[PDB]
RNA sequence: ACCGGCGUGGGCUGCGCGCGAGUGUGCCUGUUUGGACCCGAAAGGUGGUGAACUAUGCCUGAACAAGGUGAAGCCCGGGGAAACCCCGGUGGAGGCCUGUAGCGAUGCUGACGUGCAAAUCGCUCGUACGAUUUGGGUAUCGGAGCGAAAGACUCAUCGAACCACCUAGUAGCUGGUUCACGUCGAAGUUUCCCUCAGGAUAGCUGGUGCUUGUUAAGAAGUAUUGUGCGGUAAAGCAAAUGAUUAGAGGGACCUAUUCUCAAACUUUAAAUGUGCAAACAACCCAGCCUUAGUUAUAACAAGGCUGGGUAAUUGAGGCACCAAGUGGGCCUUCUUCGGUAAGCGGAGCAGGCGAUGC
RNA sequence: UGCAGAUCUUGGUUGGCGUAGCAAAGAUCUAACGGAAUAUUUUUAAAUGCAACGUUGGAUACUGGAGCGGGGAAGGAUUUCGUGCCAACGGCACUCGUACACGAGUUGUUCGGUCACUGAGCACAACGUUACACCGUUUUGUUAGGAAAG
RNA sequence: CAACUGCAGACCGUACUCAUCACCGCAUCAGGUCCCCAAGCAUCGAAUGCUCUGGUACAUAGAGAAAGGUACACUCAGGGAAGUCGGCAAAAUAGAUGCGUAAGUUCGCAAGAAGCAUUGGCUCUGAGGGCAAUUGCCAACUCAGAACUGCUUACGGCGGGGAAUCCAACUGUAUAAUUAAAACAUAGGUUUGUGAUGCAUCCAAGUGGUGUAUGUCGCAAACUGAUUUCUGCCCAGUGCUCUGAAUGUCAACGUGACGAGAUUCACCGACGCGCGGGUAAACGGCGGGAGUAACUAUGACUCUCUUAAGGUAGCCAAAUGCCUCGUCUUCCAAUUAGAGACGCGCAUGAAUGGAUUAAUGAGAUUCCCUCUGUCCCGAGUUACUAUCUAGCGAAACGACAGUCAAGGGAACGGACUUGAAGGGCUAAGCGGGGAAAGAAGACCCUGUUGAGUUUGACUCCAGUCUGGCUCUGUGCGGCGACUUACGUUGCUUCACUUAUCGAAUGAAGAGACCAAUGGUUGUUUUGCGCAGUCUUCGGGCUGUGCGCCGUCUAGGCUGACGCGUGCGGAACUCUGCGCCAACGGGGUGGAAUUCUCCGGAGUCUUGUUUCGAGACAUCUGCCAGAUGGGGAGUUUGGCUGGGGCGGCAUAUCUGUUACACGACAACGCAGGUGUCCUAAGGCGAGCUCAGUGGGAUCUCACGUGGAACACAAGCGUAAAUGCUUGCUUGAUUAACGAUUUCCAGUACGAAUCGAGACUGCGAAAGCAAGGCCAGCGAUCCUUUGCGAAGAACAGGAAAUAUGAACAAAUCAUACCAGAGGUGUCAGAAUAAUUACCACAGGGAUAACUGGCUUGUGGCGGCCAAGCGUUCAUAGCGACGUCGCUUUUUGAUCCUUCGAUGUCGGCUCUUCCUAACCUAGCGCCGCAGAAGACGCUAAGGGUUGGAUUGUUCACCCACUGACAGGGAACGUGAGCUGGGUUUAGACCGUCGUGAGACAGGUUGGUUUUACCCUACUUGGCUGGAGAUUG
RNA sequence: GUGGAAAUGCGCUUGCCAGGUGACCCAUCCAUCCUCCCACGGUGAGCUUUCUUUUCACCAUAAUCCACCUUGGGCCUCUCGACGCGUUACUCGGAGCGGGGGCUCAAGAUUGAAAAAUGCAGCACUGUCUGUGAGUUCGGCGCAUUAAAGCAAAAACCUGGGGUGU
């Protein structure tokens, strides 16, 4: 037979991302001596729209450190912010929204966005539209801090991670039903090659395990095993259930 | 060399010996390998060249007559206690409608069908502000790429492109195979084979002979005489086994009969057949020899030595070596099995055609 | 080392046969001139030199501005111009020609390009891998365990 | 620095074209090819028609009413779909204005729904504005109205409409060159994996690559297919999964034993499997049989079998129903068609989605109005051809040729036999034959030929998971295990950091100074005691004490200094200021401020850029196990009245076929065989069986086998070859003895006659090395038995041989005799599918024509029991028997596989008779009328429609009548293309799957005549020895 | 350096830093240049059997520069508003509407230099024009509308903050 799309895809030819008209990626400010042991201060100039992206970005402006410029950063805004307000980022930095604080300094009950999982990672979690973490717990003799993460699942990180304070902006935006086939044309033209998308039944045997037959059908049961080799892991992967779900739903990953 | 059993025993085995026949070379024929008498696959492998056709993404440019309908927002009048509800304008939305250019290709199953054309022409037809059309640049390819998915397309090439090479690939299968005369001249049958369109093996044929003979040596698809073998035709059921009709004499039963039968019944039993013999490497008689065989021993067995006497009519007997073609058959007489039958299928004996005219 | 056939190979010849045809895009006529292409007869004038070509004037007509108009890119590369010429070629014709022959023609401080920008992207250096560089990385501010500023 | 002035301004391109002749299509080819400029009138106008400027008369022409054609050309009386598979094609509607507009609906639409009226020309009137001082002057064509007058209904351009059923929600895409669709996509719905040392995944490989410039409102992987209303039951099977490893099983690595060692054994040993849970919007599945209610009929009710569960809500002869043209209503004169109903439904049914749906459709179907040359039934006209001429000028094909009838023949002759025609050359037509041309048949079969695809085929490879070793270091504790409680050791707990791994940063400020279960051999000279124990006599090691390394600090408390806290700290308070290349101060030296350092700006480094994890990872390499159509390679018997399914005629035994020696075939007939038996083998003795009759199991007589002998059958046997009984192991060994059957005079199996040893039973002669003939197996490999102990001064008639430099003990190997098996039985290791298909061939072999046959089909004779009011025969005629035909279907396999175009209809000619009508006769159960039967007769005739692709059939009508057949099942270079029978797609059933179905459904290129003959017309010209004598 | 109360006007050099131009292409409406009609006039040809103060053609001004009334937008000042201003159109105003007077940007208009010395038509010389209406993407409304669709980048150039110089 015939390699297989989701195989193809891995070559990366014609399914890479489209950047051209991007902003950058959107990280936090660098940890440094000033955001360790005082704080900083900046401007929020302009809040812009990028291709491909649900959320908002924020352009703020801050003073170099050591040196007679100006440095010019990008990050995810949350909501309410506005342009002229101030930014302060650092440990003696209030509880604000838009601040940003390590994850030490903030009450329990609070919510963050922009989380750190690793100190110096300038934000990895909680970046999507209307999504955000809750700080569950702190931990003085090891300090370790506890977060409820989207999913539902618990995560430990070091209190020495920064966060921002508040919710991602933007958000409700999968709420409003798209109507037409061109309206799902302009929302993937931003990302990448993935849309429309054929049945895998609707192929031929030499394409896809699901090809083939007099009639359209899978002769063989869809939930595969995680052990199976590329090209014949399609379906669903290493399932614990199917069906409907009748009742509460566990929480989902490993 | 391998043994058995208690001496000048015994019985198996060798591509053994038994007064050598080999060896070198020339030439022809057969067996085998190689391109292998000549030409022919669908395939398989290695290394390269293509996205000017066409598929999809991206960068930067260009294009889309004339009409219909009339969404939000806005203005002014009315009605109402409130909540709010009505008329008239304005405005110009939509993967909206009619319709050019553009982009396509439904029907005539029209024209042409050695064409204008290796897919074109004429009317008619779909859409025509959008998931729209298009130039240049750029990015992803052959056990691969790409695909709103048709096994679509990747330079007239795709259920796996093109170029060169391995490669004169293999073919139990189809086609071909070039002078004359002369001497002979078949087979389609047996056994074994993943064998059934092919082989090996025996038979039929040719060549080369060897040993001999001149009336017959170990002669004969034929008779005679003598002496063996047989259960088919016929016959039988008043005889065994099986089937079967009806009366008679003592409803069954018994006795003696009676009509009608048999590839897998038989007392009897042909014709046509089929073994053997009818002499010289033999027989008959006489006198002897040997033995570890037989017999209680004259007598038998077996191998020898020395002298006497001995069924027509046709005619060459015996023995090797090497090799070819063939291994689809068909018809008729008589005897026959299956089938309603067949210019049907399957056998026995003989003669034919094939191979042959007159 | 001998050929009659292998839908055999390469040349040549052949009936069919002066046959099938040379039918989309409407179309030409007239006088004078040119030309070897005439007004060609010795055996009144018509019944014995037909048919066809170019230029100019006149007539008639087509394209009908999404044009058989006037300029460019891709591609072509002397097809451009003048003079001459009619063997072969323009599936009829030619005195015509994008044909043949001989000579000519393309002029920039400002026009287009380079000088002198970045884009989708490419891949020298450096490093790593590979039996073998003819391999990989090389724009998310950006090469290289990285001392790359003259 | 702004003016002016002087001088100098490099390189390449530049002609022409851009297309009905300059480019790509073999060409000056009706095909294709990007950009700019774009006039007047009609008109809504870049529609369409005509014209000024610019550009062109270039595409072979002349003459000219044959047939038949093509057309971007027309018209037809009366009827109006009667034509046809089907209204295909044509006709038909049409602009604008005023009025008017239904069901249904997601309230947007449907809608231009449907339908009605007006429209020319001419002469007038009104309304709709601007600027200057009520006046004056001036511009744009739109709309409304009136009088008069006219029509031959009069350019171009420009929707036909309505009522329903099926499918898909819609716009869109899509097999370039036969399929545009119901297929794909879509919005909506559901499920799965996943928190980055991640999930999916590329590469031969690395500090390599993609989704990821990302972060659960994300990314990756599936299924269904708008809205509305719903989505039932089943976890037994297969799959997936579990935070169950609880126990059984297992590989390397490890740990111990016997042995001299190779070897051998024991223990330990992970995931997985097993066991136990979960899961169907995972693959999938979702029952039978009796009885029963006041006429019958049905059965709410009962009983009984049985599943993992027994089809729920819905829907239906539906694109799914075989029977089937189902049954009822409606639509027509008539309906295998359509719609509405009914439902034990071969074989409907719920995200393998069920039901319903407005709007939309070059989708499939039925009816109605309008309209028509589709038809009754054809006729006339035009332009270009064909036809004749001038110029120019091919191809395909071509064994040789070209008149028929019958015969036989390879079973359909141009050539052959017999007969009958035949005059030379010829122009325009035509499509009967040349089984005409085009292509080494694509259907079917065969070959020890392939390829694409699948999986529970055979043999394997990546990927994934798991264990061991290595990478790999330092300490503190526990549980064991082994050696006399101290030494090694395997598991583990905890604390570390330097190997290693992850991340960030332009390696941009780590830690301490706050002081120890720190080090103190130190950049330029810092060590000092105590105790114990060693010494090479110089001084060390261990444990303890004191010094030194070693030290500053914003702020906040306490009484300008000390002492606790603090740990590098001076920042204005929901919305946008500047901030840089040092001021000052201390010294060194030179002067009246110039150079240097030190602070401003805290010191130090047993050293790591900083964080996280950390001796683990799954970080590197090497071994080991499991899983693994993701991938690679290969295979997937034979015979056969084609092949397949079936069967075994594939190795074998009896009777018969079989024709009186022997041999003899069929998917011929009737039956067997792969076993069974320490006795059912061997021998001696005694006895007589099956059955019958007479007497109360017992007794007597008869009894030729009519019983028995393991089994199939045949043969054989009576003081026995049978039965009972006693003793036994001849079912052992048997020096390579010979032979028969099959047969090649090979093997294997079976069997016969013997020689030797030791025996059994018998008083002996004698019988017995299985049970009589069917009951079984090569090479290579594996495995067992025999070559016991001694004797020999030497390998001998007597001691098995070898491991090749020689010796000791193991081990391996040879020679002889058996066993483990090949049933396709003279003996490869083996699953499917192809309608996407390929190649070499086969008329050795099927599907259509033809040929033989005639069971079956059809059509008739002979006899006469009966029926016919009595009466065999007016008319019929059973039970029997004799034929004919080739118009049915079978049987066969002769011709054709380098191809003979396969159903029906349309058109047209001809032949037959077994006679429906028309002609002439006879007879009747023939009064008249109307009919039955029979004979001679084939001259003439035999219809229009509804449903269906049909042939056939069945209805409605007319008629004198609406007969049956043949001609290659007449007729495709005559047509048409509805059916059948490729590739697309949907349903039902079947299959794990790719796929299958002579089941249903929809869409799907019909090529060439100019040659010979035949036929139809049209002309020229010879010929009497039918050219000569 | 300097003028004005203000909007802002007129006449030495940049190690470093910060802005801007480049730079983002619109239905509708208005609109330059341009071409197409009309009205008046000049010049030259055409028809004339009969009519036609008639039919046809032409009537042109390149770049560059000087001086300085219309339209649209931004802003200053005085008087300080609740109803008021304004578009075909979906607006706006104590965070400052409207009115008087001004500053400024963009697109046009007008006078002049160039330039009649040129060009055109007729025969050496003659003539050598303006005003209306319709169409048309330069420019303007930093424009409506879908948007889960919402600014390509860089060289080069311009100005300022600081500093230097006078
Ligand atoms: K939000
Ligand atoms: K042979
Ligand atoms: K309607
Ligand atoms: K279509
Ligand atoms: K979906
Ligand atoms: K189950
Ligand atoms: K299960
Ligand atoms: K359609
Ligand atoms: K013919
Ligand atoms: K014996
Ligand atoms: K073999
Ligand atoms: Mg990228
Ligand atoms: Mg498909
Ligand atoms: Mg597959
Ligand atoms: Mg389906
Ligand atoms: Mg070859
Ligand atoms: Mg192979
Ligand atoms: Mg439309
Ligand atoms: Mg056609
Ligand atoms: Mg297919
Ligand atoms: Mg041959
Ligand atoms: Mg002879
Ligand atoms: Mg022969
Ligand atoms: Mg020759
Ligand atoms: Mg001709
Ligand atoms: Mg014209
Ligand atoms: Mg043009
Ligand atoms: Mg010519
Ligand atoms: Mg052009
Ligand atoms: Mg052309
Ligand atoms: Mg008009
Ligand atoms: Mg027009
Ligand atoms: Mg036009
Ligand atoms: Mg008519
Ligand atoms: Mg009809
Ligand atoms: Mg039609
Ligand atoms: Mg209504
Ligand atoms: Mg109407
Ligand atoms: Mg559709
Ligand atoms: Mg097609
Ligand atoms: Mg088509
Ligand atoms: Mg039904
Ligand atoms: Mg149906
Ligand atoms: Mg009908
Ligand atoms: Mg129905
Ligand atoms: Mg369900
Ligand atoms: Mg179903
Ligand atoms: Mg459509
Ligand atoms: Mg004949
Ligand atoms: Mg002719
Ligand atoms: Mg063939
Ligand atoms: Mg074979
Ligand atoms: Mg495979
Ligand atoms: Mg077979
Ligand atoms: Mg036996
Ligand atoms: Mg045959
Ligand atoms: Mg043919
Ligand atoms: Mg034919
Ligand atoms: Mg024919
Ligand atoms: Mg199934
Ligand atoms: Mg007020
Ligand atoms: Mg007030
Ligand atoms: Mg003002
Ligand atoms: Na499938
Ligand atoms: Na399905
Ligand atoms: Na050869
Ligand atoms: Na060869
Ligand atoms: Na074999
Ligand atoms: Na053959
Ligand atoms: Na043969
Ligand atoms: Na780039
Ligand atoms: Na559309
Ligand atoms: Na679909
Ligand atoms: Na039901
Ligand atoms: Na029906
Ligand atoms: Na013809
Ligand atoms: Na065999
Ligand atoms: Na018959
Ligand atoms: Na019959």
């Given at each position: ?111 963050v966005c922009n989380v750190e999982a690793?100190?110096?990672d300038?934000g990895t979690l909680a970046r999507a539209?209307?999504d955000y973490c ?13 977060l409820?993460l989207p999913?539902?699942?618990?995560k430990?990180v070091?209190?020495?991670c920064?966060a ?91």
């Open positions: 037979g015939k390699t297989v799309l989701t195989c193809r895809k891995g070559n990366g030819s014609v399914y890479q991302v489209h950047g051209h008209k991007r902003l950058g990626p959107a990280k936090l400010r660098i940890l440094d001596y000033a955001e360790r042991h005082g704080f900083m201060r900046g401007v929020v100039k302009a809040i812009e729209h990028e291709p491909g992206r649900g959320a908002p970005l924020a352009r703020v402006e801050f003073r170099h450190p050591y040196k007679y410029r100006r440095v010019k950063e990008l990050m995810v805004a949350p909501e309410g912010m506005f342009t002229g307000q101030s930014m302060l980022c650092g440990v003696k930095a209030p509880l604000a929204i838009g601040n940003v604080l390590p994850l030490g300094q903030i009450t329990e009950g609070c919510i690793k100190v110096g300038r539209s209307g809750i700080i569950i717990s702190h931990n003085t003799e090891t300090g370790r801090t506890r409820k999913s539902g699942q618990k430990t070091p209190s020495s920064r921002m304070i508040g919710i991602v902006a933007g958000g409700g935006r999968i709420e409003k039903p798209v109507l037409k086939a061109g309206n799902s044309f302009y929302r993937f033209r931003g990302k990448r090659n993935c849309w429309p998308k054929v049945r895998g039944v609707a192929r031929n045997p030499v394409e896809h395990p699901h090809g083939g037959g007099n009639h359209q059908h899978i002769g063989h049961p869809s939930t595969v095993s995680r052990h199976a080799p590329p090209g014949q892991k399609v379906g669903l992967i290493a399932a614990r259930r199917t069906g409907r779900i009748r009742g509460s739903r566990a929480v989902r990953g490993a």
